[PDB]
Amino acid sequence: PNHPLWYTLCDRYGLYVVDEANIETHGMVPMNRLTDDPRWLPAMSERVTRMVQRDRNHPSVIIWSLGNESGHGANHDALYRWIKSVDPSRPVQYEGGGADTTATDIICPMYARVDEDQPFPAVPKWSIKKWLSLPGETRPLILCEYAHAMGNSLGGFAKYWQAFRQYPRLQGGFVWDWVDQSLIKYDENGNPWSAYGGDFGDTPNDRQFCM
Amino acid sequence: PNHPLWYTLCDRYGLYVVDEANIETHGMVPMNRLTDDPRWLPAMSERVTRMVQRDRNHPSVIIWSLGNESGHGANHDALYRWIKSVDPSRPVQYEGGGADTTATDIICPMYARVDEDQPFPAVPKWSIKKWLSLPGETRPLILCEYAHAMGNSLGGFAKYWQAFRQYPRLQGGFVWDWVDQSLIKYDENGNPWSAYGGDFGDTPNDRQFCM
Ligand code: NA
Ligand code: NA
Ligand code: NA
Ligand code: NA
């Protein structure tokens, strides 16, 4: 959840917002180790419930998200249902556990490609065109993350947009991402420069992946 | 419906058969002028019911077809339901009226392309990939006709098969078609030559379109 003024500004200038609970357990092995554990349900519930309690009156918020990269666990299903029960006015989405679980109203993959399947074990990233028409599938598809804009990037961006326009149920996506997470450091002469992972003695680090 | 030996040969050699009622009113304006008319229901009914009565014991017959290129009329819906009642063991398909009407268990377009939409008024031929995922659409898609093999043709055949293999609900199609409908004529020396439309003084005719 963002600074409260953000939602007010989105209300007034006009931007659709996905409000997302402060839950990410990416580093766990497997990714759902905590989110499938009922002992972590209380901590998780608070991050979801208190977000909804705060932001539910903002028109800009159109979709609730259960967090990010925390696999798929029983705690997600419980909290998905909690939100649907308390606020039926907004769809709930969540990408974890393969982007099309029982904890999401929207197929919301990250970095699924337009035409190319990436058939990973358990959590495949289908071609977005293909994903829509899998046997039994009826949900809209909106990429929670796509077109990773790291450095000299966004090659093939046009391919996504051609598909979005051609396919009714391909309803767009959210580019990753808005702003380089660089930090200003100063050299011996007091001149500013842009720093990334590792430049503060931080180790282990993931270098330029923050930009 | 074919010569009765055909189904016995398909039973024994092993080919899947779509058995199709002898009903085509292609030249009507509009195409459903007769098939929407209750006065033509008795005539149409006999072409459907007597085919089913003749051929229902052949295992090679896996799908019933209501005919071809006759638009979509109320008579089709009635006969669709008749078959579903008397023989629940086989799906019923029919392409007329846009290939995805209420008279068909299978989206069965003719000459719908793999990636390119042809948005004709009333009876669009969507890209087959796009067609599967149209809002609310759940049926399998099998082209009743595709890859028109007229003369030097079948360009882009691989594009269909790549799509068929990638998309579970794209379950193939029937190439148009098996054999050239050329006829034998003889020159002054008794030498045979292949003839097409118009070669018999027949007019109006559609020339080489029979091949
Ligand atoms: Na779309
Ligand atoms: Na990053
Ligand atoms: Na297929
Ligand atoms: Na022809």
Task: Return the C-alpha torsion angle A107, A113, A116, A120, nearest 10.
Answer: -60
For residue B128, which residues of chain A lie inside 8 Å, CB to CB?
none
Q: Which residue has tokens 């006065």?
A: B39
How far, CA to CA in Å, does A8 sit from each of A13, A59, A62, A86? 9, 9, 14, 22
Structure tokens at A12: 């007034």
- Nearest CB to B117: which of A127, A138, A166? A166
Strand partners, B110: B145
Separation between Cα atoms, residue A96 and residue A73, nearest integer Å: 9
Residue B203 amino acid letter: T
Q: Where are the alpha helices (DSSP H) in B101-205?
A: 128-132, 157-166
Helix (H, G, I), strand (E, B) or coil at A57: coil
* Contact status, residue A10 vs residue A4, Cβ threshold 8 Å: no
- Cα–ligand 1 centroid distance for B127 (angstroms): 14
Tell me the residues surrounding ligand 1 (ion) with CB < 5 Å: A 164, 170
* Contact status, residue A130 vs residue B166, Cβ threshold 8 Å: yes
Strand partners, A106: none
Separation between Cα atoms, residue A118 and residue A113, nearest integer Å: 8
- Cα–ligand 3 centroid distance for B112 (angstroms): 16
Give the technique used to solve this structure.
Answer: X-ray
Structure tokens at B151: 């003369």
Task: Centre a 10 Å sphere on the Cβ of residue A186 and count the other Cβ atoms it contains.
Answer: 10
**Would the CB atoms of B133 and A135 count as touching at under 8 Å?**
no
- DSSP3 helix / strand / coil % (chain A, rounded to 5): 30, 20, 55
Sign of the CA dihedral with A18 first, then A22, A23, and A27 last: positive
Q: Where are the alpha helices (DSSP H) in chain B?
A: 5-13, 41-55, 74-86, 128-132, 157-166
- The distance of B88 to chain A (nearest Cα, Å) reads 22
Resolution rounded to one decimal, in angstroms: 1.9
Q: Which helix (H) or strand (E) holds B71?
A: none
**By CA distance, what is B130's nearest residue in A?**
A167
SS (H, E, C) A93-127: ECCCCCCCCCCCCCECCECCCCCCCECCCCCCECC
**DSSP assignment, residue B107?**
B
Separation between Cα atoms, residue B196 and residue B209, nearest integer Å: 8
For residue A127, which residues of chain B lie inside 8 Å, CB to CB?
166
Task: Centre a 10 Å sphere on the Cβ of residue A95 and count the other Cβ atoms it contains.
Answer: 26
Residues in Cβ contact with B38 at an 8 Å cutoff, skipping those fewer than 6 apart:
B74, B75
- Cα–ligand 1 centroid distance for A129 (angstroms): 11
**Which of B108, B111, B110, B23 has its CA nearest to residue B73?**
B23
How far, CA to CA in Å, does A205 sit from each of A18, A150, A176, A209? 29, 17, 20, 9
Q: Which residue has tokens 């923050």?
A: A210
Looking at CATH, the fold of the domain delimited by A1-211 is given as TIM Barrel (3.20.20)
Which own/partner contact pairs does B119-125 have at CB distance under 8 Å and 24+ positions apart? B122/B98, B123/B97, B123/B98, B123/B99, B124/B98, B125/B99
Question: Cα–Cα–Cα angle for A61, A63, A68, nearest 5°?
Answer: 110
| B24 annotated to a ligand binding site | yes
**Would the CB atoms of A133 and B166 count as touching at under 8 Å?**
no
Residue in A126, A133, A162 to test binding to B, most B beta-carbons within 10 Å = A133
- Helices (H) then strands (E): counts for chain A: 5, 7
**DSSP assignment, residue B43?**
H
For residue B134, which residues of chain A lie inside 8 Å, CB to CB?
168-169
Helix (H, G, I), strand (E, B) or coil at B167: coil
Task: Centre a 10 Å sphere on the Cβ of residue B165 and count the other Cβ atoms it contains.
Answer: 10
* Contact status, residue A22 vs residue A43, Cβ threshold 8 Å: no
Separation between Cα atoms, residue B186 and residue B37, nearest integer Å: 45
Burial of residue B120, with CB atoms counted within 10 A of its CB: 0-12 exposed, 13-18 middle, 19 or more buried: exposed
Separation between Cα atoms, residue B184 and residue B146, nearest integer Å: 27
Helix (H, G, I), strand (E, B) or coil at B101: coil
What's the distance, Cα to Cα, between the start and end of chain B in Å?
21
Residues in Cβ contact with B117 at an 8 Å cutoff, skipping those fewer than 6 apart:
A166, B124, B125, B126, B127, B130
Sign of the CA dihedral with A35 first, then A38, A44, and A50 last: positive
- Which ligand has an atom closest to residue A141 CA? 1
Helix (H, G, I), strand (E, B) or coil at A44: helix
**Which of A208, A93, A87, A71 has its CA nearest to residue A153?**
A208
- DSSP3 helix / strand / coil % (chain B, rounded to 5): 30, 15, 55
Helix (H, G, I), strand (E, B) or coil at B104: coil
Give Cα A202 to chain centroid, integer Å: 26
Residues in chain A: 211
* Contact status, residue A97 vs residue A32, Cβ threshold 8 Å: yes
For residue A169, which residues of chain B lie inside 8 Å, CB to CB?
133-135
For residue B142, which residues of chain A lie inside 8 Å, CB to CB?
none
**Would the CB atoms of B129 and A129 count as touching at under 8 Å?**
yes
Residues in Cβ contact with B185 at an 8 Å cutoff, skipping those fewer than 6 apart:
B192, B193, B194, B195, B199, B200
Residue in A130, A131, A134, A165 to test binding to B, most B beta-carbons within 10 Å = A130
Separation between Cα atoms, residue A150 and residue A165, nearest integer Å: 25
Q: Which residue has tokens 């002898």?
A: B22
- The distance of B100 to chain A (nearest Cα, Å) reads 15
**By CA distance, what is A117's nearest residue in B?**
B166
Task: Return the C-alpha torsion angle A199, A201, A207, A208, nearest 10.
Answer: -20
Separation between Cα atoms, residue A110 and residue A121, nearest integer Å: 16
Task: Please tell me the number of Cα atoms within 13 Å of A76 on its side-chain side.
Answer: 34
Ordered by start, the domain boundaries in chain A are 1-211
Separation between Cα atoms, residue B120 and residue B182, nearest integer Å: 32
* Contact status, residue B79 vs residue B105, Cβ threshold 8 Å: no
